[PDB]
C-alpha cells in the first residue's frame, strides 16, 4: 500500500481479501481485491476487462501487478443484493424495484455478452446497489481467468445455488446461457424471499432443480443423456407449475422466468430478448430504502 490507505478489511472474497481503501493520489474510495496465488495469461485476460465499461458493470479501475502480487481496484458500492434481500425479508423488495433491478441486470448481461464476456458465477453477493436506484454486476470475466473453486482461501464453501444444469452435468463448454440461468434463480429469490434451489452438494443441487422443473429428457433437452455426469438412474420427477413456485409473480413475470430456466441452454432466452419481454413494458427506476 505504497499507493493506497486501507480504510478497513471489508470481507473475505472468493479469491482473496477485500479492502475498502483510499487512493493516495486521487483521494477516491475504492474496493481493493487481493488475488491469492497457490500467471501471465490471467494478467492479459483480466487487463482487457478495463475496457468493458457499462453503467451496470462495477468499474474495474486498475489491475495492479507489483511485488509479484495481483490487486484489482474497483469502484466502491455501499451494499450488495444478498444483504439488501436479508434486510428486506419481513416485507419483501417491492415489485417495481425487483423489476428495475432485473431490467438493469439484463442490460449489463446484454452488454457483456455482446463483447463475448461471460460471468459464470453470478450470485446476490456480487450484485452491488447504490442510493440512486442502480444495481451493478461485480467480478464479470474473472472466472475464465481463475476458475471457480470448491472452497475460498478461508474455507467458505462457494455456493452452488445459482449454477446452471449443464455445468452440474459436467459440460466444459460454457455459453452466455449460464448467466441467464443464474439471473433467473436470483429473480425468483427476490420475489419469494427464499432461494429457489439451495443445494448443499452437486447432486442435491441437481435433484432440487429436477424436483421443481422435472427430470430433463431428450424431448425437452436434446443431447442431455450424453452429457458427462448424466446417469440413466437419475430419479424421474414431474415438473411443477411456476404458479406454485413463484407466487405472487404475475403471468408476464412467470413467462419470462420460464424462458430464463429452460433446461436446454440453446432454448433459454438471451439477455437482449429478455429486455423486450412484456414484463418490462411498465418498468421504472425507483429509489430504494438503503440504511448505510
DSSP states along 142-208: -HHHH---SB-TT--BPP-TT--HHHHTT-----THHHHHHHHHHHHHHHHSS-S---SSHHHHHHH
DSSP 79: E
The answer to whether the Cα torsion of 224, 230, 231, 233 is positive or negative is negative
Cα atoms in the Cβ-side hemisphere of radius 13 Å centred on 162: 25
Residue 75 marked in a binding site: yes
Burial class (CB in 10 A: 0-12, 13-18, 19+), 273: middle
The three-point CA angle 230-220-227 to 5° equals: 20
Q: Nearest-CA neighbor of 233 among 198, 206, 263?
A: 206
Distances from the Cα of 234 to the Cαs of 122, 203, 210, 211, 266, in angstroms?
A: 27, 10, 9, 11, 23
Residue 123 grid coordinates: 450470485
Residue 224 marked in a binding site: no
Query: Which residues have a Cβ under 8 Å from the Cβ of 241 and sit 6 or more positions away?
Result: none
Residue 45 marked in a binding site: no
Q: Nearest-CA neighbor of 135 among 86, 98, 93?
A: 98
Could you tell me the domains of the chain? 4-75 (3.30.200.20), 79-276 (1.10.510.10)
Residues with active-site annotation:
121
Question: Helix 251-260 crosses helix 177-192 at what angle (to 10 degrees)?
Answer: 140
3-class state of residue 105 by DSSP = helix
Lateral strand order in the sheet of 17-23: 4-12, 17-23, 29-35, 69-75, 60-66
User: How far, in Å, CA of 260 to CA of 283, rounded?
Assistant: 18
User: How far, in Å, CA of 190 to CA of 85, rounded?
Assistant: 7
Residue 202 marked in a binding site: no
In the block, residue with C-alpha cell 418490462? 280
* Residue-wise DSSP of 224-263: GGGSTT--TTS--PPBPPHHHHSTT--HHHHHHHHHHT-S
Data resolution in angstroms: 1.1
Residue 23 marked in a binding site: no
Residue 76 marked in a binding site: yes
User: How far, in Å, CA of 162 to CA of 158, rounded?
Assistant: 11
Decide if 21 contacts 32 (C-beta within 8 A).
Answer: yes
Residue 232 marked in a binding site: no
Residue 17 marked in a binding site: yes
DSSP 24: T
Amino acid at each position: 500500500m505504497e499507493n493506497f490507505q486501507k480504510v478497513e478489511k471489508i470481507g473475505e472474497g472468493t479469491y482473496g481479501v477485500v479492502y475498502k481503501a483510499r487512493n493516495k493520489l486521487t483521494g477516491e474510495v475504492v474496493a481493493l481485491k487481493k488475488i491469492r496465488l497457490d500467471p501471465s495469461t490471467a494478467i492479459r485476460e483480466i487487463s482487457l476487462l478495463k475496457e468493458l465499461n457499462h453503467p451496470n458493470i462495477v468499474k474495474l479501475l486498475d489491475v495492479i501487478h507489483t511485488e509479484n502480487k495481483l490487486y484489482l481496484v474497483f469502484e466502491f458500492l455501499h451494499q450488495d443484493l444478498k444483504k439488501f434481500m436479508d434486510a428486506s425479508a419481513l416485507t419483501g423488495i417491492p415489485l417495481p424495484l425487483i423489476k428495475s433491478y432485473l431490467f438493469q441486470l439484463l442490460q449489463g448481461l446484454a452488454f457483456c455478452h455482446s463483447h463475448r464476456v461471460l460471468h459464470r458465477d453470478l450470485k446476490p453477493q456480487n450484485l452491488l446497489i447504490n442510493t440512486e436506484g442502480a444495481i451493478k454486476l461485480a467480478d464479470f470475466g474473472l472466472a475464465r481467468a481463475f476458475g471457480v473453486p470448491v472452497r475460498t482461501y478461508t474455507h467458505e464453501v462457494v455456493t452452488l445455488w445459482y449454477r446452471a444444469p449443464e455445468i452440474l452435468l459436467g459440460c466444459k463448454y460454457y455459453s452466455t446461457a449460464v448467466d441467464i440461468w443464474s439471473l433467473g434463480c436470483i429473480f425468483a429469490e427476490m420475489v419469494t424471499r427464499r432461494a429457489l434451489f439451495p443445494g448443499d452438494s452437486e447432486i442435491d443441487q441437481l435433484f432440487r432443480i429436477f424436483r421443481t422443473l422435472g427430470t430433463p429428457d431428450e424431448v425437452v433437452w436434446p443431447g442431455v443423456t450424453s452429457m458427462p455426469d448424466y446417469k440413466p438412474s437419475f430419479p424421474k420427477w414431474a415438473r411443477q407449475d411456476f404458479s406454485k413456485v413463484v407466487p405472487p409473480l404475475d403471468e408476464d413475470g412467470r413467462s419470462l422466468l420460464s424462458q430464463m430456466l429452460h433446461y436446454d441452454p440453446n432454448k433459454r432466452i438471451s439477455a437482449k430478448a429478455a429486455l423486450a419481454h412484456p414484463f418490462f413494458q411498465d418498468v421504472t427506476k425507483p429509489v430504494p430504502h438503503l440504511r448505510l
